[PDB]
Amino acid sequence: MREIVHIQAGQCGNQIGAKFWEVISDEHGIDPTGSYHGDSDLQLERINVYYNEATGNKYVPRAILVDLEPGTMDSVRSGPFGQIFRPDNFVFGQSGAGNNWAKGHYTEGAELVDSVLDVVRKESESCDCLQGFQLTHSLGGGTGSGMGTLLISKIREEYPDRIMNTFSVMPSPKVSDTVVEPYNATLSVHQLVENTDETYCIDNEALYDICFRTLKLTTPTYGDLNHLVSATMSGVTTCLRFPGQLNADLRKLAVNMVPFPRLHFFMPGFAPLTSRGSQQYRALTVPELTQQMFDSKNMMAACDPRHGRYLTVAAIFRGRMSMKEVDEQMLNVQNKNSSYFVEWIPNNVKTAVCDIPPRGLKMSATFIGNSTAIQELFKRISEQFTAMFRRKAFLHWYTGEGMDEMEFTEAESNMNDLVSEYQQYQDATAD
Template identity: 85%
Template sequence: MREILHIQGGQCGNQIGAKFWEVVCAEHGIDSTGRYQGDSPLQIERINVYYNEASCGRFVPRAVLMDLEPGTMDSVRSGPYGQIFRPDNFVFGQSGAGNNWAKGHYTEGAELIDSVLDVVRKEAENCDCLQGFQVCHSLGGGTGSGMGTLLISKIREEYPDRMMLTFSVFPSPKVSDTVVEPYNATLSVHQLVENADECMVLDNEALYDICFRTLKLTTPSFGDLNHLISATMSGVTCCLRFPGQLNSDLRKLAVNLIPFPRLHFFMVGFAPLTSRGSQQYRSLTVPELTQQMWDSKEHDVCGRSTAWTLSNSISHVPWQDEYKRSR
């Protein structure tokens, strides 16, 4: 079986990752104790992609959870599916990164990275045929951006022929007021261009607008944004978790979607999106769903003009090669 190893880092990454596993467990018929309670053979046909089967028929997520402070880990453990994770796969420090990319990448994160890599190696050795890694993190904080990109670069060195998929949450002043978020994101994007194979771009501002305008939530919370992201992640990974012909693994997904290796930043759309009050009055058809998917208002990332500017700027990053040739 072609397994995927899931890694979540930082406060944002762990909160989104916890919601993701709640959704995935529900889709595969796994309860909060890790036991299968489903009613369809399709639910467990490819369950080994994301789960290890332990003794007594329990299914354990193939996940590594890391952070530079213990608070997030405690909240994940006390969550509805907190007992499903393997206890040894929680790796955390005590100091925190303080929204500082350099702390996560060079100091506190660098001290903890060997412990994380040990857990990653153990999980990778338990796989029959590891197809790649899936990293869930934000680019605005210190741990998810700094230590997250450090881990991605270390994994790229150790597993150069495995695929690397990231779910990266880009910052926005609408959702947070941390002044250093743009610097953290800029430093992280450079690392993602070099070391990631596929990057699902999730924009906090677009998610906030979807919750406010489409879902009619007057004061969207981080829980609302995380729920939207987890539903999107579940939809993106459906082709990897269930039997099918199209995009059945990470490499096929990359072959079908990436025109040039460095241009691997994907804009994610999700449909249908309707407010709770209007769901019972609508009967969506296939043309309506298709129209919603291509509507920029339903994308979990910035508007088309901004995204085009972003992709253009990323495609011109190879200034380093020109600089080396000039020397």
């Protein structure tokens, strides 16, 4: 295992995908032309996990860009680092998915998926030892949600022994494009429960609240939200991209984080998140990072971990700092928060330190939690779903594509089962 193949689908998927590539390219010292201009050998040691190396010492993201309309991908191509992507790796239709999961999954998306699979195969066939895949998409639209989950199923068929990882952006009425987002999300979660190994729940609700409440951005834009998302995606992939001992590949991460196969939905978190004004008063230190990363306010899913229990946790620190201090602070936080870690999985919090900090910070921390409190996210979606479904609002958009109600009922039930399962393990005891 070594190479990861990245896929980004739909508007949200391509927008956060592009930022992810901008951010990590900077971290690895790769410029927009794909040339290396860094100072540390750490930047190149594991560069092939994410980049192909071409002729002329060029590094090309192992990235595939997918959409059912040309607009976003055109903007990516024109954006920063837009020329870094392999032009043949842009696969797009013209008809769009109209914010309709069914069109993405069964109709328009189905017409396009084989040409996408052709590119996946070409990337995968050239891998020395393919680890698996990471997909970026929203669950609230049509393409990322419907076609993205279609792609997942088809890829799994051809690579059944490889790890499937997603960064899945959950919809929120605070940042809302359409009224059917709860339908699209529930149908999508239905797929994710069955067909991915690990999913980062990137919640627009949480991103909005961090921007508005913490960073005091009166009118957060998608740009503001995406800055947080790329900081998080940088953080949760540092163990894969830089030399290290813990969770160094997708499968070892899954083995540490997923005790039951369906419970693979992670709450990501980032520290520090303090406004410039408050930074005047509060020092950036290891204890500050540690307390912040375990606080609800720093989570990228709108769930309070103190309303549930942790099955497993990964904590990754970045920057120059005392290993002794990190260890003491991580012991301290587990002690003070003992009740909130399940007693029947011993030593379930793992800690790593990476020497290279994010751009513009002396140090940072990234949190990955598999917490039963994630049920709060799924319940929020479920409540919005049921309100619409009990009055059959807008179903004709989906039945018009050939689906029947029963499929809605099944996705609903599977997502409600997932919630009950989190609750079961939350309530379990060693005795």
